[PDB]
Amino acid sequence: LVPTAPSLGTKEGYLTKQGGLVKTWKTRWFTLHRNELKYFKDQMSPEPIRILDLTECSAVQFDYSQERVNCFCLVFPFRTFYLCAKTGVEADEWIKILRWKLSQIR
DSSP, X not given: OOOOOOOSSOEEEEEEEEOXXXXXXXXXXXXXXXXXXXXXXXXXXXXXXXXXXXXXXXXXXXXXXXXXXXXXXXXETTEEEEEEESSHHHHHHHHHHHHHHHHHHO
């Protein structure tokens, strides 16, 4: 494998996620390609744990209540994911591209 750069409208990186069954916090690798947001155990995992179809996403919101770290939520019909970036810059980068992506799908 040989790295390069994002194909515009794409992004990859680690995000901390809140569990579905139990509210534990896990660091996963996320990729954004087209209208699909996926997350893997780690970068080299060939298959994604889940694939989120963004055409079903109705909202992306920063959580101004959490003043310790930078997190935001992805609202879907049957579940709202809560995600935390490792830094403010990363949080900002993810939210911008996800919001832009919903504006396009829309």
